[PDB]
A paper describes a structure:
XPB is part of the general transcription factor IIH (TFIIH), which is functionally divided into core TFIIH and the CAK complex. Analogous to the stimulation of XPD’s helicase activity by p44, the enzymatic activity of XPB is also regulated by its binding partner p52 (6). We pursued the structural characterization of p52 from the fungal model organism Chaetomium thermophilum (ctp52) using x-ray crystallography. The model shows that ctp52 is organized into four distinct domains, an N-terminal domain (NTD; aa 1–120), two middle domains (MD1; aa 121–319 and MD2; aa 350–454), and a C-terminal domain (CTD; aa 455–514), that interacts with p8 (40).
We solved two crystal structures of ctp52. The first structure encompasses amino acids 1–321 (ctp52_1–321) and was solved at a resolution of 2.8 Å. The ctp52_1–321 model comprises the NTD and MD1 domains and the ctp52_121–514 model the MD1, MD2, and CTD domains. Both crystal structures were superimposed via the MD1 domain (rmsd of 0.87 Å) thereby generating the full-length ctp52 model. Due to the overlap of both structures, we were able to generate a full structural model of ctp52 at atomic resolution. The ctp52 structure is predominantly α-helical and consists of 22 α-helices and 15 β-strands. None of the newly identified domains present in ctp52 (NTD, MD1 and MD2) displays significant structural homologies to any known protein domains.
Residue numbers in the entry: 10 to 71, 79 to 165, 176 to 240, 254 to 319
Write the structure that this text describes.
């Protein structure tokens, strides 16, 4: 619904930057492309030259409903461009997806688990309370902007404001009132709610870059996919991340996708919000 809509707006140049990254290409591939599109793309990545449409039809076989829809989804997202009789895949996407399917991606590009002992008090229950309360607060905030005829971190308020889930208002003590977006946002399922905010967190950095040209969204998104491949209740090693990702842990903590302990900022714990992402 949301990620798809977001992606359908992205210009080619970004897609090819995003597909410098196996995990990304493989994540999209895995959990955007429908059962058939996968099948079509597999063969396509394997076969020698930009082959014949008719041969892809011979690949199709049964059921025979999505034969059209599958062409569109493929057409919009990847850099898998074609001209009648010829249907190519973009080097970047090919190269990226291959490495992924051959499990030959950088060793240090995944959630490196941590050797350090795990505080007995940090269980799935803790990591659920934490995350839950974190989201409670955000939801309470956007709620407390509904006319009545502390809350979250300042960085989130400003993000909701920028996102137009909330609008500045002269009348109200808060200085803030709910938008129709905000209403819609409040009705969405906890998954859709997290994506709604994350996509804003992304757009924000574009809206910034654009001006600041008087990390990029792609880096932020890649990392998100990574966090969706990690395991819940397991501690991961901070140092193994790239500077750009070490530099995103605060935002994701604010959002409740990550617990750090104060005791040891060598181990980051993804919450259920982080691992669910792509499975929803």
């Amino acid at each position: 619904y949301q990620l798809s809509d977001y992606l359908e707006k992205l210009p080619g140049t970004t897609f090819r930057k995003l597909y410098q990254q196996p995990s990304s290409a493989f994540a999209i591939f895995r959990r955007m492309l429908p059962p058939l599109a996968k099948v079509f793309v597999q063969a396509l990545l394997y076969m020698p030259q930009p082959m014949l449409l008719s041969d892809l039809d011979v690949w199709v076989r049964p059921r025979a409903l999505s034969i059209l829809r599958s062409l569109h989804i493929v057409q919009i997202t990847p850099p898998g461009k074609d001209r009648p009789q010829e249907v190519q895949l973009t080097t970047n996407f090919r190269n990226s997806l291959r490495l992924a399917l051959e499990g030959g991606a950088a060793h240090n590009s995944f959630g490196v688990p941590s050797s350090l002992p795990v505080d007995p008090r940090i269980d799935i229950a803790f990591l659920d309370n934490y995350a839950r309360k974190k989201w409670e607060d955000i939801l309470h905030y956007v709620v407390s902007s509904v006319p009545v005829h502390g809350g979250p971190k300042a960085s989130v308020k400003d993000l909701l404001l920028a996102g137009r889930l909330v609008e500045r208002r002269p009348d109200t003590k808060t200085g803030i009132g709910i938008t129709q977006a905000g209403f819609t946002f409040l009705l969405q399922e906890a998954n859709a709610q997290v994506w709604t905010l994350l996509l804003l967190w992304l757009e924000a950095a574009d809206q910034a870059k654009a001006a600041a040209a008087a990390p990029d969204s792609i880096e932020m998104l890649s990392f998100l996919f990574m966090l969706a491949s990690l395991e819940l209740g397991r501690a991961y090693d901070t140092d193994a991340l790239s500077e750009t990702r070490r530099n995103m842990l605060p935002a994701l903590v604010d959002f409740g996708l990550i617990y750090i302990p104060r005791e040891d900022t060598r181990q980051y714990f993804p919450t259920r919000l982080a691992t669910t992402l792509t499975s929803s």
